[PDB]
Design an enzyme around this catalytic site. Structure first.
Site, mmCIF file in Angstrom:
data_model
loop_
_atom_site.group_PDB
_atom_site.id
_atom_site.type_symbol
_atom_site.label_atom_id
_atom_site.label_comp_id
_atom_site.label_asym_id
_atom_site.label_seq_id
_atom_site.Cartn_x
_atom_site.Cartn_y
_atom_site.Cartn_z
ATOM 1 N N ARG A 49 -16.118 -11.232 -2.821
ATOM 2 C CA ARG A 49 -15.118 -10.182 -2.694
ATOM 3 C C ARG A 49 -15.310 -9.500 -1.350
ATOM 4 N NH1 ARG A 49 -15.393 -4.746 -6.292
ATOM 5 N NH2 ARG A 49 -17.182 -4.434 -4.891
ATOM 6 N N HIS A 530 -13.667 11.172 -10.394
ATOM 7 C CA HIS A 530 -13.854 9.935 -11.143
ATOM 8 C C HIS A 530 -15.097 10.012 -12.020
ATOM 9 C CE1 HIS A 530 -13.738 5.453 -11.664
ATOM 10 N NE2 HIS A 530 -15.035 5.656 -11.816
ATOM 11 N N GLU A 531 -16.214 10.472 -11.451
ATOM 12 C CA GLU A 531 -17.462 10.521 -12.204
ATOM 13 C C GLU A 531 -17.456 11.638 -13.239
ATOM 14 O OE1 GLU A 531 -19.412 8.027 -11.799
ATOM 15 O OE2 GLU A 531 -18.232 7.279 -10.109
ATOM 16 N N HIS A 534 -15.617 10.341 -16.130
ATOM 17 C CA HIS A 534 -16.451 9.361 -16.820
ATOM 18 C C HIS A 534 -17.212 9.971 -17.990
ATOM 19 C CE1 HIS A 534 -15.795 5.535 -15.211
ATOM 20 N NE2 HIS A 534 -16.542 5.592 -14.123
ATOM 21 N N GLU A 593 -12.998 2.866 -16.811
ATOM 22 C CA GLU A 593 -12.801 3.070 -15.382
ATOM 23 C C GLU A 593 -11.375 3.491 -15.055
ATOM 24 O OE1 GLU A 593 -14.728 3.224 -12.810
ATOM 25 O OE2 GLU A 593 -16.587 2.843 -13.897
ATOM 26 N N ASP A 597 -10.063 6.802 -13.038
ATOM 27 C CA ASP A 597 -9.221 6.705 -11.849
ATOM 28 C C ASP A 597 -8.018 7.635 -11.955
ATOM 29 O OD1 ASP A 597 -10.883 4.898 -10.616
ATOM 30 O OD2 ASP A 597 -9.724 3.127 -11.196
ATOM 31 N N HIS A 658 -14.665 -2.585 -13.828
ATOM 32 C CA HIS A 658 -13.642 -2.000 -12.976
ATOM 33 C C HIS A 658 -12.451 -2.944 -12.864
ATOM 34 C CE1 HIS A 658 -17.532 -0.326 -11.801
ATOM 35 N NE2 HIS A 658 -16.905 0.744 -11.346
ATOM 36 N N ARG A 664 -6.129 -0.850 -9.087
ATOM 37 C CA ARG A 664 -6.642 0.513 -9.129
ATOM 38 C C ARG A 664 -5.740 1.458 -8.349
ATOM 39 N NH1 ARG A 664 -13.186 0.896 -8.674
ATOM 40 N NH2 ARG A 664 -12.606 3.085 -9.039
HETATM 41 O O1 LIG Z 1 -18.984 -0.725 -9.051
HETATM 42 C C1 LIG Z 1 -18.242 -0.981 -8.065
HETATM 43 O O2 LIG Z 1 -17.969 -2.176 -7.774
HETATM 44 C C2 LIG Z 1 -17.671 0.155 -7.219
HETATM 45 N N1 LIG Z 1 -17.954 1.430 -7.850
HETATM 46 C C3 LIG Z 1 -16.870 2.248 -8.362
HETATM 47 O O3 LIG Z 1 -15.749 1.882 -8.267
HETATM 48 C C4 LIG Z 1 -17.181 3.586 -9.024
HETATM 49 C C5 LIG Z 1 -18.378 3.411 -9.955
HETATM 50 S S1 LIG Z 1 -18.131 4.394 -11.461
HETATM 51 C C6 LIG Z 1 -17.515 4.613 -7.944
HETATM 52 C C7 LIG Z 1 -16.225 5.055 -7.260
HETATM 53 C C8 LIG Z 1 -15.294 5.803 -7.960
HETATM 54 C C9 LIG Z 1 -14.122 6.206 -7.341
HETATM 55 C C10 LIG Z 1 -13.881 5.857 -6.023
HETATM 56 C C11 LIG Z 1 -14.814 5.110 -5.322
HETATM 57 C C12 LIG Z 1 -15.986 4.707 -5.940
HETATM 58 ZN ZN LIG Z 2 -16.386 4.317 -12.544
#
Ligand SMILES: O=C(O)CNC(=O)[C@@H](CS)Cc1ccccc1
Ligand SMILES: [Zn+2]
Ligand SMILES: *[C@@H]1O[C@H](CO)[C@@H](O[C@@H]2O[C@H](CO)[C@@H](O)[C@H](O)[C@H]2NC(C)=O)[C@H](O)[C@H]1NC(C)=O
Ligand SMILES: *[C@@H]1O[C@H](CO)[C@@H](O[C@@H]2O[C@H](CO)[C@@H](O)[C@H](O)[C@H]2NC(C)=O)[C@H](O)[C@H]1NC(C)=O
Ligand SMILES: *[C@@H]1O[C@H](CO)[C@@H](O[C@@H]2O[C@H](CO)[C@@H](O)[C@H](O)[C@H]2NC(C)=O)[C@H](O)[C@H]1NC(C)=O
Ligand SMILES: *[C@@H]1O[C@H](CO)[C@@H](O[C@@H]2O[C@H](CO)[C@@H](O)[C@H](O)[C@H]2NC(C)=O)[C@H](O)[C@H]1NC(C)=O
Ligand SMILES: O=C(O)CNC(=O)[C@@H](CS)Cc1ccccc1
Ligand SMILES: *[C@@H]1O[C@H](CO)[C@@H](O)[C@H](O)[C@H]1NC(C)=O
Ligand SMILES: *[C@@H]1O[C@H](CO)[C@@H](O)[C@H](O)[C@H]1NC(C)=O
Ligand SMILES: *[C@@H]1O[C@H](CO)[C@@H](O)[C@H](O)[C@H]1NC(C)=O
Ligand SMILES: [Zn+2]
EC number: 3.4.24.11
Lengths: 696, 696
Positions: A49, A530-531, A534, A593, A597, A658, A664
């Protein structure tokens, strides 16, 4: 009234390069914000990726290389061990000379591999036992086979550790791969050939005759058995409810309801568990409380393992132990995984050696690597700014509760209490820079050799399991960081009820003191939201403010959450991915996830609107004809400008919780009213549907 | 008065991100113009050199990939054959499935490899001869061993082709590597190990016994033999005078002067030259005029070849043939070159397959690939503007003749005469786009297969050498381009007295209609001056306006030129390269390129000041606190923002006729009075030494 400083030019030029002004933002905002990125960037031969998110990981790997490859002499013993482990990992000349001897010399310790032994029954078969065999792979090397045993946190007692029993992983990424039909045709073929290729090369190195007729038949027994184990495991869709997975019972109760028969003799759970915990000097009585996560798997496991001999069982248990170690031997053993790696990731060649070693040292010595990273890349002035940004977004989520109509008054009363009880971890733990003695003692029992890399990863495996198993009688460390500082990611802990933002993510395009506030809230602002969300998705909502698995929802509010989230299960479940042959995404596994978002993108925009009316508007960026309201969603989208390989697209659907960056952006903005307001999207457009999902 | 377009924003940001504002422009302008590039860009694993110049090539390979991967229904036969060749090249599955069979099946054509043959004396020893062994490697594959034979343009009769005889190149980058000590110690070890590895792989695939000691004996004799041949070649510093290399003599005079004895029998030059030219059905009588370039080498070759057997000679000649084809076979044969490739280039991996394939198809079908490139990335409106820029710089060169005090009056007129007769080539040849019949007719004899890549590269080797050998009795076609359009470079032909600027280089940071004139003159303007000056350096000055090697210099002007050029020999010779382990640049072998750099930038700057006098000052760029006179030198320097790997810095110091980008900026601007005036540099600063070299 337009900014013209140096930082405003570099910021605007980066946005102009990725986007494509010729496309309509309301038709496909992913192709609008990433149209320029797709034309310029091509997936490297070593990446499954490639996106702007993955590029940041590569740029962080660069900084790790500069602080490790340079013997800076005046380093503490911890940093020296960190660098000595790095040098042992990069010297391919010393590693290629040993061949497969470092792996073959410790195979007698794991009861050997029956396919590569001249006479295995007389040497190992007499003292062989399924209890001590699985225990040796677990306690010494961390390879969970047949039965997954690990010391974790009690879901209902966040202060204590407790033994967990769950179904193990598989040689292939998921249990869906063991269908071996259609899109998994090459994977199973390359996986069995991976066994045969390793079986051929191992016998050649020991001076044993090559009986190719037996290898093709004996290795298919390993695949036949592992397909039955995959078929016996529980689907990941039925494992998203933590309340349903929690099954605490005593070890004697495990022996009663989950008995197993190996070689005509009953399996001993006390013998198996004690053979693991004896390595850390801990006795496990029959009245030991153990949480079992896969009770259906253990039931289906009994009629299967009784149909195979001890030789057939050791062939599968040893193969799982070897398949993760051939990549640490000579080039003759490294390239045997190319066909298997290409089937699962599509990469023609393995990544750079220094890149792998930078990640491995960062994975086993996260406190020492984070020490060098924050001193060479992270600015100390970013602490109070991110601290204030969290408090703003935390307050945004609290004020947003009263606007949500799918919850009653009593549920919101303590849903705010959990949000008020969220603790934060920003940057790095201070003790990794100010206390060199504590850092040295943390890696005191580690002893790395310059030309013995294989003996250093084995020492890291034994050290990792020894450190984890010793916590069974000890309480949960409250100051312990769940991640290192040199990580481009963000985390939430359900058992600790905390959000962690390491230094690796507190950089552009997420956050910068020299970039516009519309980009900070569109970047790190959505990350913080985002967190926080969660802690309220389909998994975190079942945990209270103290990290305990306690139901604080009323029946009406909990049923509405499943109704609000059901919208997103069908939305992302209907997304057809052209890179994966038109297959759809898993609306159930990616639910947690997707909730974070859509919830985070709205809270970041709300916190940004509260900042504009409080501190005033911002000067436009030169060269781009978008207002700062539109720049908010542009920076959010440009984080996920990327593309996948066809092989990894099938892998990420079944393994990555994700959604891909393409959806997303699409899914989160389709449900965003503030996105369609900023770009004035017409009704029933692809980015502005009349039916929108909404949770937080 | 500041530009605000989207093109000005990303143009200024490129200048800001590459430069380092903390550095002093007058202490080290390379660090001032590239200090930001050095922290931002790191050398990839597949690049021996990484610079802003190489990135333009890496970006061009992406455009080649898009126009070659997918077939289209309207493609002409020439386009279909290019895409057929490209698809055969990218299919790594078909290539790996063939192993080394395409090479093993072909090796008999070059009298085989004695070390990898069951009985070389019995199979090839009866009909073997040195005349036929060198001839077959020359006329069929372009592998020049022992004696270099090629049909090229007559130095003194630019309208006629003639046979050339010169010393060949070596398996190592230069004759200095065969010292095998210090910085060359690792190269020789990997070189001989490379021979042993390929000898083992070929015998293993042939089912022949492997003798580790016998192979090591025969391959060390190869190195011992090639050590003498390298020691017999004339140094590159003694080959820069074209008047001293031109030795025209008949074939009967070559047999008399340069007699050779091999295996006890005399070497027949008439037999050797005719064994080559018979492939195009051309007889070579003893009255044939031949140009001998290395008479000292052919004399020193007498006592060497006598001491070696037919097996020893063929072990070296075939190894030169095999070492360049081992990277086209399966992965096992690709990995045999790793240690050898790292020693000479520092690269830990071969570049991406699609990158090699696109570059390969671009090299063998330059008119077909150039057609697909100009129709997809090149704007035709650039040609007229570049025509106008050449006329200004050409006139500046003629006007500069009045300022030069080291030339008499009659030599200035002859210098003006050659400058007026310079032809120009811009963009692409019109025939590759407007005449489909001519383009298809060019590749009429080529016929590629989808799944036989190695069969295709061998067909290209015969066709490549056949097209040039058949030009012996043909006049030099004046309209024939000397480069493909999809090339990021520029060329000057001494025999044609023409300057060529392909479409690949007519792009940022060199030229762009949306770019400041200061950047265009500092970019492509300096390149045009570099190309024109090439006709007046230590080599180009020996050719008249029509391209014939004749002396039009007076004795005083010729002596004064060598005195003025001797300054640059000391200036660049005194540069110590840290990346090369403290080694110094070769001021003699880099003299022509250093002269073209110094003279060119002065012409471009003078041409730019003439433009500002007639058109007025331009708008400043945002975020850059520099005037346009400073942006002229800045864009010139930012073209060469890059670094070398230490293994290749030793390589390029002996092979590349160009100076490193670090010292082309330092050396050219140290001799520029206008640079120190534009940046207000104090006298005797590092970038402004009071003693400055001056030629043009
Ligand atoms: O696990 C992955 O591949 C990338 N991690 C993520 O997509 C999340 C992990 S919860 C962190 C994040 C949230 C929102 C915006 C940016 C980054
Ligand atoms: Zn996440
Ligand atoms: C990488 O490993 C190689 C092989 O172990 C090292 O090369 C050896 O170096 C020792 C040093 O005394 C010599 O005695 C050996 O003869 C060398 N072996 C070979 C095969 O060359 C090398 O030194 C290691 N690299 C580093 C930086 O230590
Ligand atoms: C688990 O069971 C095994 C055997 O079933 C035990 O190993 C035995 O240990 C005793 C002494 O401790 C020896 O006399 C036996 O010969 C061993 N048996 C075998 C087959 O090797 C093991 O000790 C048990 N584990 C625990 C923790 O008690
Ligand atoms: C390189 O070649 C030269 C000759 O071209 C060699 O020099 C000769 O060395 C022999 C003894 O080895 C003397 O008898 C001759 O008088 C030398 N001749 C000249 C002209 O110097 C030189 O030894 C060779 N070097 C290597 C490394 O092979
Ligand atoms: C080829 O050989 C001839 C004869 O040996 C060389 O011509 C001689 O050159 C010397 C100068 O060193 C004169 O003194 C002789 O009078 C010349 N003889 C003849 C017959 O011309 C010639 O120089 C050699 N060519 C090369 C390139 O070495
Ligand atoms: O061939 C190379 O390595 C680089 N070629 C060059 O440096 C010259 C070709 S002589 C063209 C050029 C001149 C000045 C500036 C840019 C490009
Ligand atoms: C999977 O297991 C179930 C029972 O656990 C059985 O009915 C079914 O046939 C099995 N399928 C395969 C493919 O083994
Ligand atoms: C590559 O070659 C293999 C084997 O010859 C063939 O099966 C495959 O279809 C080829 N791929 C393409 C894209 O032609
Ligand atoms: C070279 O000589 C051999 C043997 O005399 C002969 O067979 C061959 O045809 C000759 N080469 C040419 C090109 O005539
Ligand atoms: Zn040049």
């Amino acid at each position: 009234g337009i900014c013209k400083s140096s930082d405003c030019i570099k910021s605007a030029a980066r946005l102009i390069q990725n986007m494509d002004a010729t496309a309509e933002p309301c038709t496909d905002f992913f192709k609008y914000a990433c149209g320029g990125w797709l034309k310029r960037n091509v997936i490297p031969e070593t990446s499954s990726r490639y996106s702007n998110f993955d590029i940041l990981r590569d740029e962080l790997e660069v900084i790790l290389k500069d602080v490790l490859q340079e013997p800076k002499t005046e380093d503490i013993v911890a940093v020296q061990k960190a660098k000595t482990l790095y040098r042992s990992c990069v010297n391919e000349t010393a590693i290629d000379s040993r061949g497969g001897q470092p792996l073959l010399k410790l195979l007698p310790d794991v009861y050997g591999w029956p396919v590569a032994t001249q006479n295995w029954e007389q040497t190992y078969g007499t003292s062989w036992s399924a209890e001590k065999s699985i225990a040796q792979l677990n306690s010494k090397y961390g390879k969970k086979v047949l039965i997954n045993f690990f010391v974790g946190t009690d879901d209902k007692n966040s202060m204590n550790h407790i033994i967990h029993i769950d179904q193990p992983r598989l040689g292939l990424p998921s249990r869906d791969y063991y269908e071996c039909t259609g899109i998994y045709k090459e994977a199973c073929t390359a996986y069995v050939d991976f066994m045969i290729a390793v079986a051929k090369l191992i016998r050649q190195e020991e001076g044993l005759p090559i009986d190719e007729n037996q290898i093709s038949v004996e290795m298919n027994k390993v695949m036949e058995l592992e397909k039955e184990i995959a078929n016996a495991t529980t689907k990941s869709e039925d494992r998203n409810d933590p309340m349903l997975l929690y099954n605490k019972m005593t070890l004697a109760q495990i022996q009663n309801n989950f008995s197993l028969e190996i070689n005509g003799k009953p399996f001993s759970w006390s013998n198996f568990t004690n053979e693991i915990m004896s390595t850390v000097n801990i006795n496990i009585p029959n009245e030991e409380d153990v949480v079992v996560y896969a009770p259906e798997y253990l039931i289906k496991l009994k009629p299967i393992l009784t149909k195979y001999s001890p030789r057939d069982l050791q062939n599968l248990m040893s193969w799982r132990f070897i398949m993760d170690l051939v990549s640490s031997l000579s080039r003759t053993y490294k390239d045997s995984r190319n066909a298997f790696r290409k089937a699962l990731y599509g990469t023609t060649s393995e990544s750079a050696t220094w890149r792998r070693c930078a990640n491995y040292v960062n994975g086993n010595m996260e406190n020492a690597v984070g020490r060098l990273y924050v001193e060479a890349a992270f600015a100390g002035e970013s602490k109070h700014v991110v601290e204030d940004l969290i408090a703003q977004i935390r307050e945004v989520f609290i004020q947003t509760l009263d606007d949500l109509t799918w919850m009653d008054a009593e549920t919101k009363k303590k849903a705010e209490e959990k949000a008020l009880a969220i603790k934060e971890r920003i940057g790095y733990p201070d003790d990794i820079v100010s206390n060199d003695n504590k850092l040295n003692n943390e890696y005191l029992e580690l002893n790395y050799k310059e030309d013995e890399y294989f003996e250093n990863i084995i020492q890291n495996l034994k050290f990792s399991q020894s450190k984890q198993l010793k916590k069974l009688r000890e309480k949960v460390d409250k100051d312990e960081w769940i991640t290192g500082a040199a990580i481009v990611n963000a985390f939430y802990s359900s058992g600790r009820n905390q959000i962690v933002f390491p230094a690796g993510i507190l950089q552009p395009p997420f956050f910068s003191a020299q970039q516009s506030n519309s980009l900070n809230y569109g970047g790190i602002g959505m990350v913080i939201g985002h967190e926080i969300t969660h802690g309220f998705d389909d998994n975190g909502r079942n945990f209270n403010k103290d990290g305990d698995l306690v139901d604080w929802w009323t029946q009406q509010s909990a049923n509405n959450f499943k109704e609000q989230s059901q919208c997103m299960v069908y939305q992302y479940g209907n997304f057809s991915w052209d890179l994966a042959g038109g297959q759809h995404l898993n609306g159930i596994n990616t639910l947690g996830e997707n909730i974070a978002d859509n919830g985070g993108i709205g809270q970041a925009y709300r916190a940004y609107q509260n900042y504009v009316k409080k501190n005033g508007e911002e000067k436009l960026l030169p060269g781009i004809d978008l207002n700062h309201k539109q720049l908010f969603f542009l920076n959010f989208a440009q984080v996920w400008c990327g593309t996948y390989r066809p092989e990894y697209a099938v892998n990420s659907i079944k393994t990555d919780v994700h959604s891909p960056g393409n959806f997303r952006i699409i899914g989160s903005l389709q449900n965003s009213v503030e996105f369609s307001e900023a770009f004035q999207c017409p009704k029933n457009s692809y980015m502005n549907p009349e039916k929108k999902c909404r949770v937080w």
